[PDB]
């Protein structure tokens with residue numbers, strides 16, 4: 001019926017409604033560190049999030065998205081392997097039922113507790129909807145989360161979750177600064193891939209940061225209290241909303257570092 005992460009509508013079933021699921025440039029993938037090619041021609045990433053304007057947080061039934069005003073060049077990503085300017089539209093996470101799983105990308109088969117995705121679209125395309133139809137339309141920054149010390153800049157997000165517990169709920173979420181979610185280093189791996197949920201379009205340049213951020217056990221615990229279902233429906237906790245690693249096929253992962 002409609003896709004999700006259960007036994008009956010989970011990732012292994014998505015291909016029946018979205019045949020691109022078995023495509024040549026699907027994400028996530030496992031990052032084999034010894035096979036990744038250092039590419040000295042890759043430039044440092046440029047993250048300008050000082051003018052970021054967050055607007056709202058929404059539970060869409062598969063994750064929670066923090067949305068930003070993308071009507072002007074306020075929070076952009078450029079540099080790295082990118083040509084042009086990519087504007088931040090939303091961020092969301094993927095997490096597990098246990099601390100040993102939850103990320104989508106893996107590093108030498110290692111899974112992290114969660115994975116943050118900062119989604120950006122290429123301004124040459126004018127809007128998000130046009131950007132997803134192009135091979136270079138989106139740039140997604142992926143950041144792994146491991147459990148350890150709390151991340152102070154994540155607390156504002158954690159505290160509003162009670163208010164968007166079920167599908168379709170939203171809350172005003174202004175003045176949130178996404179700079180509090182970045183690791184210290186911006187070293188990364190990059191490869192051409194896709195969105196990791198339907199419609200699985202192959203329009204993403206992935207930029208996965210090598211350095212994870214730490215979150216406390218209590219912070220990740222609050223993610224696991226959300227619900228996949230709508231209000232008044234039987235409770236299904238929002239956990240394990242990650243797609244497993246897909247075949248690399250004819251692709252090379254490049255590293256910005258050695």
Ligand SMILES: O=S([O-])[O-]
Nearest residue numbers: 117140195196197
């Ligand atoms: O942002 S990736 O989940 O499609």
Ligand SMILES: [Zn+2]
Nearest residue numbers: 092094117196
């Ligand atoms: Zn994602």
